[PDB]
Design a protein around this nucleic acid. Structure first.
Ligand SMILES: NC[C@@H]1O[C@H](O[C@H]2[C@@H](O)[C@H](O[C@@H]3[C@@H](O)[C@H](N)C[C@H](N)[C@H]3O[C@H]3O[C@H](CO)[C@@H](O)[C@H](O)[C@H]3N)O[C@@H]2CO)[C@H](N)[C@@H](O)[C@@H]1O
Ligand SMILES: [Mg+2]
Ligand SMILES: [Mg+2]
Ligand SMILES: [Mg+2]
Ligand SMILES: [Mg+2]
Ligand SMILES: [Mg+2]
Ligand SMILES: [Mg+2]
Ligand SMILES: [Mg+2]
Ligand SMILES: [Mg+2]
Ligand SMILES: [Mg+2]
Lengths: 182, 183, 260
RNA sequence: GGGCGUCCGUGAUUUUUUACUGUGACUAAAGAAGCGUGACUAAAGCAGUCAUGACUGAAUUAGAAAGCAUGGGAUAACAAAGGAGCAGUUUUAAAGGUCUAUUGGAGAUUAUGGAGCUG
RNA sequence: GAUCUGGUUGAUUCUGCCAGUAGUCAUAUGCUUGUUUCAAGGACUUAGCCAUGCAUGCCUCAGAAUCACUGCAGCAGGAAUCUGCGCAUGGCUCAUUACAUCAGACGUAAUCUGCCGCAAAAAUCUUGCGGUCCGCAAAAUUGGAUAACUUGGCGAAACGCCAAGCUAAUACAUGAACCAACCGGGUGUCUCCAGAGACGCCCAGCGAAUGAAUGACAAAACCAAUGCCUGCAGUAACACCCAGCAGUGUUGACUCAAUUCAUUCCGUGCGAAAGCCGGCCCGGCGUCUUUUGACGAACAACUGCCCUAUCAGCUGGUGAUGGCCGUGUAGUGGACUGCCAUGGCGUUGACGGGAGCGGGGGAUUAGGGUUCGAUUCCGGAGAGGGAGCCUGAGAAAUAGCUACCACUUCUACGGAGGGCAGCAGGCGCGCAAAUUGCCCAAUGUCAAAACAAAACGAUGAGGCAGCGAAAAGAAAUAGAGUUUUCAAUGGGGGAUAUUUAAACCCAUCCAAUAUCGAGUAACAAUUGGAGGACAAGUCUGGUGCCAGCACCCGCGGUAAUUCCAGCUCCAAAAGCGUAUAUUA
């Protein structure tokens, strides 16, 4: 009862659950990025909505204000750090132009497809969740892992994975047992 | 028990206060002492902090002060003469603060012969009496009842609180106030 | 009679995490206020890591190994607060409780000569029985025969070994203070102007070394020297200078990138 | 040894507030906003990070009205007035008359005088 | 994202509601559910009733051990009981409650305040020996009683009891001369001078009572007493002992702090515990008094607060507003007795009635707002209702007492007990809420108390686990290629182990010489829909205004885009319907 650990909600369901324009865009986003459900889109809506709302508050504030120099250089920093904005985009008006496919390109499911470690985007989500990709010699099993810019150089196969330098996986190993009893 | 709160008092609007707690010990009062004349009997009362508050019942004596002379003498209370609250408290001879009593007047005369040397001769060596007595003079209404035998006096202590019947002698306009109300 | 603190109702400067237990060690009455102290269990366990829990922490204190102002304190709930000197003879370290410029308690390391004196502010003056005029201090001391120029707002230098008030610092215009309460707590400044307003709170206007002007109540200021150069006691590493929140945020990112 | 001007406390002299507004002073955490930080991500948390110990971090901000200080005087407000219901300043010497400081101290008497009183 | 859409007509513009829609850390229910993380959880109805167990006790080197208890060869462990603190906190609950509580802000100069911090401390004709009141002495070698225990027991019992015999103290009581001060008042003989000294006696401590005094201030002439000069130069004050040993408290303000003297405190105050250890004289403690900081308590009230007029007057004999003496209090005070006055509150909503703890805060929100707050933190209140107390520094205490009322358990009928709105549970009540679980390892509290050593303080506070689709995070149910193969790794089984107080979980792992395993991957996704709003069938079978559907519009009358079904699609998905509140 006396537990003060915090928790909040990360996604929000849309108003108007049957919009034929919206339902067609989100089925493209579930196909082009290999997503499980519409809720994984909807947290990328709320992630980007909160960036689009704070950056629109800071432009109400003048320049050489304390809450715009601090904390406006923080939101441009995390866009440059996670690959949301390339380094030319530094004016804070580019956060207001970010889209949901700009955030979905930074998921570990997408880079493992774009770096070339997997044939399809549904090949990438299997290999993450089946413990094959290490970001910095750290096995990451989360597909919604947002990859930073500095982490792109070091994505490879895991050192414990059978595809890397680890022991052979199940279908070879249970076949290597069946050839052993004979 | 007896409480000292405003929970039972009506509001200034005349409204009744609806009570939503029990009585506290921190708001108590206790039964009065009703200190009278008589041989000394006291009962202590355990107050807050563990302090003791001495109820006076039946007091007969106290230290009474003669303020022009800045002295006091332990004298014996004789009668209770006038009380401003009620005349019924005079009849039962209750001792409260500010009640008017008569006291013994013998230590005051004896002190007034030992100091200033005036009776109402023996130390011929020390006439520091002459060093006093010149500037100082004594009110006539004091010196009348001082040699009459009993002096009217005023209680300056709270006996139910302290267990003492200390006082002061009536002088000045204050004596002339109470002499008119009696006679 | 309260005997417990909840760890949420504990002061924030102690920096006890909310998820580790319901309770915090309620400091006993003593020298310093409950809101304005750091009890010795938090110093031995949470500030210094000499103890991993409260059970190792009373193995240190009950054994007589921590000295607050030259005297061993066997209470884990003893209130140690501002200007106290905490010695430990075995580990050979001695500290002073000061406020840093962010308002929190800071343990300033000391020498042997700087650890004998402490600086104490008079809170009341009265005459005791006899005709002995004693001086009441924020640390609860009652110095019996202080310097006759002692007023209430002043500072007495004390030397806790030989219990002799070696010095006095008056509270005037030309002095430097440290602020021990309010938003400005931990900041050091010269005194500019003291606005009296009798019947209410005295306001004291203060100017920093950089020139930053700021005000407090004059019951919050604690005079520690004749000027900002000639401070009678050593202060934490910022020395009462509050940097900008933007500039101090830039410097940590620069230091973290330059470290790798 | 005079002038100048401050500081502190005390007396004598004829009186202007309120709303508003700008700055301050005081105002518990948890919660909200958010600064750092790859707890594998995140919801979190305040931690940790790096090659016989090192730099340590836990920045900051909004939080109702009323209370405190101070300056700005537009707009408004409270109050009073109702205009016959009304509010001569200095130089100079003269008359009468009123209840503290020095003379070594302290006590008790004692005229002169300062400044004020009115014709 | 400061957004709307169906329904009144033959059509059309409106008004206006109903209906859709998206939230709720908001509850309940239905159908489903493989992994992990984080969590709320008998508040709502009945502050209803409770079987059983448990929830508050404390011993060090340092108060009292002759267990007829234990080892050891008197030293150590010590059951038990006196003693000292604690049980007023914590925990639960939200019934009461509108000049109350509560919030921000002040006040206590109107007051109490154990533990804790720094301090203070010169009162007291006591002992020993000899003589009958005195003498000589000095590390003061003080006195009586109770527990435990023994004996005899009473009683059906009772967290019930009696009598006798023993014996402790840091329990209770008594009591310290001289070493050992300064300072002051009142006062009788004796050397001096024309008032001064010596000696003698009574009294002179901290606290308390009453009275008095301090607690500041903001030019000469003459007589008496007196000061230095050899008439007045110059000057702290004071007849020697001390030629500066307070002429000076604090506040915004005090009748206060403190000091001087007058009187006297009769137990309702004051030991150097007549105390305990330790080191090889000194050092740790432990205690009276006094005093103040601290942690608090209690009171006072500046501004603020849901609906109600089908509630317009409220109060005042028996206190209502004020005043005077008192009383009572810890203190202020109509709090209260006596007496006098005639007030006080109200259409700026009194008074009465209904809703119910107050904030911090939550939900939603462009802005203005509209709502919820039994619930973790703060405060207030209560312990079955209602009183009244004792003890203590603090209680009007309830795992304290006394009584009544309502229920209630044991009895051998004589009697004796109960109080879960503590934690588990139980029965009821309801739409509605878990284990009669493990542990002090952590967080703390208490306290005679560091840990260790024969030698583990108590804790249903609080953790931990079991139940647990309240609500939240992260996430499987496949990938890759030429009918046909190749790789994967979880769910799950398990460990040299790891976690943990102990397990669990998660994490790590299928050889490190040497570790099980997918194919219909049968290890199988569901819940609501397909006329419109509102995404998705002019498909097939059945029924024939029937059965049913439909939030609303409407479907169904033998060719049903709407029912009952099969197929196929749509939507969200380990979830998804429905109902009632509530915001947009
Ligand atoms: N109304 C409260 C106050 O009561 C005082 O007077 C009250 C007393 O005289 C008296 O009260 C007595 C009380 O003395 C006595 N010690 C106890 C008794 N229970 C009370 O009685 C009162 O209370 C009970 C229960 O409510 C009633 O049954 C009874 O009729 C009533 N008179 O009755 C009066 C109340 O009706 C004063 N009148 C006044 O201060 C104020 O009215
Ligand atoms: Mg593996
Ligand atoms: Mg006892
Ligand atoms: Mg409300
Ligand atoms: Mg009175
Ligand atoms: Mg509470
Ligand atoms: Mg009843
Ligand atoms: Mg229960
Ligand atoms: Mg058909
Ligand atoms: Mg169908």
């Amino acid at each position: 009862m006396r537990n003060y650990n915090n928790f909040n909600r990360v996604w929000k369901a849309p108003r108007r659950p049957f919009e034929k324009e919206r339902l067609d865009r989100e089925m493209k986003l579930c196909g082009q990025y290999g997503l499980r459900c519409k809720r994984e889109i909807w947290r990328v809506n709320m992630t980007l909505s909160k960036m689009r709302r704070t950056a629109r508050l800071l432009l109400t504030l003048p320049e050489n204000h304390p809450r715009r120099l601090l904390e406006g250089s923080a939101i441009m920093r995390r866009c440059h750090e996670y690959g949301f904005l390339d380094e030319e985009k530094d004016k804070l008006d580019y956060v207001l132009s970010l889209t949901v496919p700009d955030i979905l390109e930074r998921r570990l499911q997408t880079i493992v497809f774009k770096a070339g470690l997997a044939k399809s985007v549904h090949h990438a989500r299997v290999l993450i969740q089946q413990r094959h990709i290490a970001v910095a010699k750290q096995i990451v099993t989360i597909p919604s892992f947002i990859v930073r810019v500095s982490s792109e150089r070091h994505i490879a196969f895991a050192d414990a994975s059978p595809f890397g330098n680890g022991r052979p996986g199940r279908v070879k190993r249970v076949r290597a047992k069946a050839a052993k009893r004979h | 028990g007896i409480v000292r709160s405003r929970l039972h008092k009506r509001k200034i609007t005349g409204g009744k206060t609806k009570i939503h707690r029990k009585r506290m010990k921190a708001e108590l009062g206790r039964l009065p002492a009703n200190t009278r004349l008589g041989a000394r009997r006291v009962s202590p009362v355990r107050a807050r902090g563990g302090n003791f508050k001495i109820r006076a019942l039946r007091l007969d004596t106290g230290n009474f002060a003669w303020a022009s002379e800045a002295i006091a003498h332990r004298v014996r209370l004789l009668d209770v003469v006038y009380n401003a609250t009620s005349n019924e408290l005079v009849r039962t001879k209750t001792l409260v603060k500010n009640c008017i009593v008569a006291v013994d007047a013998a230590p005051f005369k004896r002190w007034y012969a030992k100091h200033y040397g005036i009776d109402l001769a023996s130390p011929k060596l020390q006439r520091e009496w002459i060093r006093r007595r010149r500037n100082h003079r004594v009110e006539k209404a004091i010196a009348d009842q001082l040699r009459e035998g009993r002096v009217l006096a005023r209680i300056t202590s709270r006996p139910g609180q302290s267990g003492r019947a200390d006082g002061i002698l009536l002088e000045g306009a204050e004596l002339q106030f109470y002499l008119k109300r009696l006679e | 009679a309260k005997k417990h603190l909840k760890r949420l109702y504990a002061p924030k400067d102690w920096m006890l995490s909310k998820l580790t237990g319901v309770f915090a060690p309620r400091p006993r009455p003593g020298p310093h206020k409950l809101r304005e102290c750091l009890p010795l269990l938090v110093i031995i366990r949470n500030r210094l890591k000499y103890a991993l829990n409260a059970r190792e922490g009373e193995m240190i204190l009950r054994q007589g190994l921590v000295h607050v102002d030259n005297h061993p304190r066997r209470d884990g709930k003893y209130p140690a607060g501002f200007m106290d000197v905490v010695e430990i003879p075995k580990t050979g370290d001695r500290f002073r409780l000061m406020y840093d410029v962010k308002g929190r308690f800071a343990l300033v390391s000391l020498s042997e000569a700087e650890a004998q004196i402490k600086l104490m502010k008079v809170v009341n003056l009265y005459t005791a029985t006899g005709r002995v005029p004693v001086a009441v201090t924020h640390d609860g001391h009652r110095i019996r025969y202080p310097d006759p120029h002692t007023s209430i707002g002043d500072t007495i230098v004390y030397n806790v070994k030989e219990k002799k008030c070696v010095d006095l610092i008056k509270n005037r215009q030309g002095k430097a203070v440290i602020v021990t309460g309010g938003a400005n707590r931990g900041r050091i400044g010269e005194i500019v102007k003291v606005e009296c307003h009798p019947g209410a709170f005295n306001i004291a206007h203060l100017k920093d070394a950089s020139g930053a002007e700021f005000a407090t109540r004059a019951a919050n200021i604690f005079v520690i020297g004749k000027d900002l150069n000639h401070l009678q006691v050593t202060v934490p590493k910022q020395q009462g200078l509050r940097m900008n929140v933007i500039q101090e945020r830039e410097e940590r990112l620069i230091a973290a990138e330059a470290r790798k």
